[PDB]
Amino acid sequence: VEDWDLVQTLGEGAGEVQLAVNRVTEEAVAVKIVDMNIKKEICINKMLNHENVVKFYGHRREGNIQYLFLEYCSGGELFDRIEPDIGMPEPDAQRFFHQLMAGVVYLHGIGITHRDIKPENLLLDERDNLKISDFGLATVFRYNNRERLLNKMCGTLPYVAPELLKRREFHAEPVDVWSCGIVLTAMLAGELPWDQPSDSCQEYSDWKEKKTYLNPWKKIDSAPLALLHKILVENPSARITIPDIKKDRWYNKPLKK
Numbered sequence: 001v002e003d004w005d006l007v008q009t010l011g012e013g014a015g016e017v018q019l020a021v022n023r024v025t026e027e028a029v030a031v032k033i034v035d036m037n038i039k040k041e042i043c044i045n046k047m048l049n050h051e052n053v054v055k056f057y058g059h060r061r062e063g064n065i066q067y068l069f070l071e072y073c074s075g076g077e078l079f080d081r082i083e084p085d086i087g088m089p090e091p092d093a094q095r096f097f098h099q100l101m102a103g104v105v106y107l108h109g110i111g112i113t114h115r116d117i118k119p120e121n122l123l124l125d126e127r128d129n130l131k132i133s134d135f136g137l138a139t140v141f142r143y144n145n146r147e148r149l150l151n152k153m154c155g156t157l158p159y160v161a162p163e164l165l166k167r168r169e170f171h172a173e174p175v176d177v178w179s180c181g182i183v184l185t186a187m188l189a190g191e192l193p194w195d196q197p198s199d200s201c202q203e204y205s206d207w208k209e210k211k212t213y214l215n216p217w218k219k220i221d222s223a224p225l226a227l228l229h230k231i232l233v234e235n236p237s238a239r240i241t242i243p244d245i246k247k248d249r250w251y252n253k254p255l256k257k
């Protein structure tokens with residue numbers, strides 16, 4: 001029951017994730033190995049308890065190497081369900097998006113911001129249920145009902161909100177909303193819209209100018225495109241919030257393959 005076998009390498013952060021199988025129960029758990037920041041990731045992980053967030057089981061430091069025991073997601077990365085230049089079937093994208101929102105609402109509800117939402121950090125279990133993963137950049141943005149503004153520039157360029165690049169301080173929530181919009185764009189088009197949302201990035205200027213006849217926008221149906229128009233808004237104070245995303249026409253459209 002307490003004896004585990006490392007059977008296969010799952011991924012690398014960095015910098016390796018291995019699959020551990022219990023010799024008695026045959027239960028599986030993912031083991032994140034870090035050479036050996038991490039202390040914080042463990043503290044935040046201990047707070048997490050939601051169906052759309054990778055569950056944290058425990059940790060073990062055997063010297064300069066730290067071990068994190070996590071809920072195994074046999075479906076792998078959402079990234080790998082995205083066909084380059086195509087995306088995935090709209091009903092599948094919508095279901096994953098609903099699940100992503102549920103996980104994000106949960107984190108924000110407990111005062112946690114992930115800060116690095118992207119398909120490589122969204123995993124799938126055996127039933128294709130989405131699980132938010134990789135809390136190495138996550139931080140507290142609300143404590144004792146008091147919000148703290150962020151100032152650290154972090155994340156992954158194609159997914160980061162424009163205010164992160166332009167402002168000294170910014171609200172946490174709209175940044176996570178923005179990255180979810182970039183994820184939705186990738187799922188529906190199989191391509192990222194820009195290298196970064198900077199004034200010098202032509203693709204970002206094109207979006208700001210509403211040239212939706214260009215890729216990746218041209219590949220996206222008007223309905224989800226209308227939602228993206230509300231999410232990928234430059235001014236974070238004008239950007240759609242999650243409660244309003246839940247009211248969006250596409251978000252509530254019945255879809256079937």
Ligand SMILES: NC(=O)c1cnc(N[C@H]2CCCNC2)c2cc(-c3ccc(Cl)cc3)sc12
Pocket residue numbers: 010011012013017030054070071072073074075076077120121123133134
């Ligand atoms: N908590 C888990 O389970 C878990 C955690 N992290 C993973 N990789 C990191 C790498 C760095 C970027 N973020 C994701 C992977 C990859 C998995 C897998 C891979 C292949 C197959 Cl076939 C099945 C599962 S499961 C898993």
